[PDB]
């Protein structure tokens, strides 16, 4: 009861900062998005294709077994 009153009362003061709309314009002015994670993909359709990064490839172990 006291906590949910004091948190909202502090939010009223902290949210009421000056200007408050130029930063909306600053954030929305960069309509190019944040840069997204790179994957190897095909040129025509963009399905992922397998990678040979050393820090992942150094953990891999395979073996050979006879067939039936």
């Amino acid at each position: 009861a006291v906590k949910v009153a004091l948190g909202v009362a502090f939010a009223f003061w902290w949210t009421s900062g000056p200007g408050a709309d130029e930063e909306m314009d600053a954030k929305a002015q960069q309509e190019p998005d944040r840069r997204s994670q790179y994957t190897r993909h095909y040129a025509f359709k963009g399905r992922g294709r397998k990678e040979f990064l050393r820090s992942d490839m150094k953990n891999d172990a395979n073996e050979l077994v006879p067939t039936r």
């Binding site: 949910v4 948190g7 909202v8 939010a11 009223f12 949210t15 960069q30 190019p32 944040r34 840069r35 790179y38 190897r40 095909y42 040129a43 025509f44 359709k45 399905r47 294709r49 397998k50 990678e51 040979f52 990064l53 050393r54 490839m57 150094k58 172990a61 395979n62 073996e63 050979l64 077994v65 006879p66 067939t67 039936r68």
Partner: protein, 402 residues
């Protein structure tokens, strides 16, 4: 009609790589008795047994002993493994009758459909093993009253030219096929690894050949070919230094014919280095693509990761592109970026922070994520967007009452 050259520059500079090696048959390596894993020992054994075979054929009783002992362990392990197959078959014929074992159907997530309307189509008998693996390939927007999967991806992997489990030429292949009465999608990739030397017979020296092709009818009516040859060696500047070089060729064959069309040629380098307390991994590339009609277009790319002993938890990476369009004397178009990450734990929660800088538009992107598996103390910040919504509700409810 060819892809942009930034695609090739990103593809040819993606970090320090490592090729495909030899896999060992575990019952004959370490004859009879159980083993453990180590790369140098397996790589030694594969070339050691070919050498002892050549010496045993030439004469040489000491090599004949080793090769005959390997043959004895090989026969014993093979007969044991077929006995295990017979035992598994008898156990399956006991547990079920003449019935077979059935897989789980694929989960596609929630829908406004009864979710077992088509689940009986993806429950099938196994077949157990034939060499290849299949996965179904799904599209982003499926049909409304049906399952979204449309294509099939096949995967194969082998080691053909071995003598008795001492292999030669690691090889693998992957084909995606979607065929219907309207369109046709056919992508493919193959890798072949060739090992020249391993220690103590030399240093580790491995080349790798990659081929890939792209067909997409009736949208494109041209096919895409790529070929990559790249070579790695551990050394060249000091002990255990993982260096590598490579080249790439690409073409857009017009009508499918690989003799006509625009071409792309590129080369790349990688290296690692350790100076002071700084360990760095760097790679760089240059591509010399041909345009549709304009001619030469060239680009440079580079990536670097700076590992640091002290403060072993800060990750920091740097990236660069340079563009050289025609009228090259005044159209040098640079671009470079930085990336930092760190990681804390506080208040019973695990925090991770990532700071990103793009440096053309002077923007800093900060992103923090947290995870509290203990309590809801992390929700005290949830009072921040709940106030403003009220300030956008009453201000609506005022304007809706006027």
């Amino acid at each position: 009609r060819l892809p942009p050259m930034t695609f090739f520059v990103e593809q040819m500079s993606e970090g320090v790589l490592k090729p495909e090696g030899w896999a060992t048959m575990e019952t004959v390596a370490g004859l009879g008795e159980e083993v453990t894993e180590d790369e140098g020992a397996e790589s030694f054994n594969h070339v050691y047994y070919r050498q002892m075979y050549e010496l045993a054929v030439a004469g040489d009783p000491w090599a004949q002993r080793e090769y005959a002992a390997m043959l004895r362990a090989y026969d014993k392990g093979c007969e044991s493994y077929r006995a295990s197959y017979e035992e598994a078959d008898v156990d399956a014929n006991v547990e079920y009758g003449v019935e077979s074992y059935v897989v789980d159907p694929i989960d596609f997530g929630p829908s406004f459909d009864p979710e077992d309307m088509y689940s009986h189509r993806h429950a099938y008998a196994e077949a157990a093993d034939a060499g290849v693996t299949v996965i179904p390939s799904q599209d982003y927007y499926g049909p409304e009253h049906d399952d979204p999967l449309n294509g099939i991806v096949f995967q194969y992997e082998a080691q053909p030219f071995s003598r008795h489990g001492w292999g030669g030429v690691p090889f693998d292949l992957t084909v995606c096929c979607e065929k219907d009465k309207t369109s046709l999608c056919l992508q493919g990739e193959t890798h072949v690894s060739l090992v020249h030397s391993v220690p103590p017979f030399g240093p580790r020296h491995i080349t790798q050949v990659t081929g890939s092709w792209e067909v997409l009818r009736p949208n494109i009516k041209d096919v895409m070919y790529q070929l990559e040859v790249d070579t790695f060696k551990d050394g060249l500047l000091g002990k255990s230094d993982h260096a590598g070089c490579g080249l790439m060729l690409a073409r857009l064959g017009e009508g499918g014919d690989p003799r006509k069309g625009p071409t792309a040629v590129g080369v790349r380098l990688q290296d690692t280095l350790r100076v002071g307390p700084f360990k760095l991994e760097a790679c760089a590339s240059k591509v010399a693509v041909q345009g549709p009609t304009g001619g030469k277009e060239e680009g440079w790319g580079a990536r670097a990761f700076v590992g640091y002993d002290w403060l072993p938890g800060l990750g920091m990476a740097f990236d660069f592109i340079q563009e050289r369009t025609p009228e090259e004397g005044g159209k040098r178009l640079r671009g470079y970026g930085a990336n930092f990450t760190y990681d804390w734990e506080a208040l019973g929660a695990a925090f991770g922070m990532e700071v990103d800088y793009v440096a053309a538009s002077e923007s800093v992107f900060v992103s923090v994520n947290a995870f509290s598996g203990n309590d809801y103390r992390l929700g005290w910040l949830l009072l921040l967007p709940a106030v403003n919504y009220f300030k956008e509700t009453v201000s609506s409810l005022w304007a809706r009452l006027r």
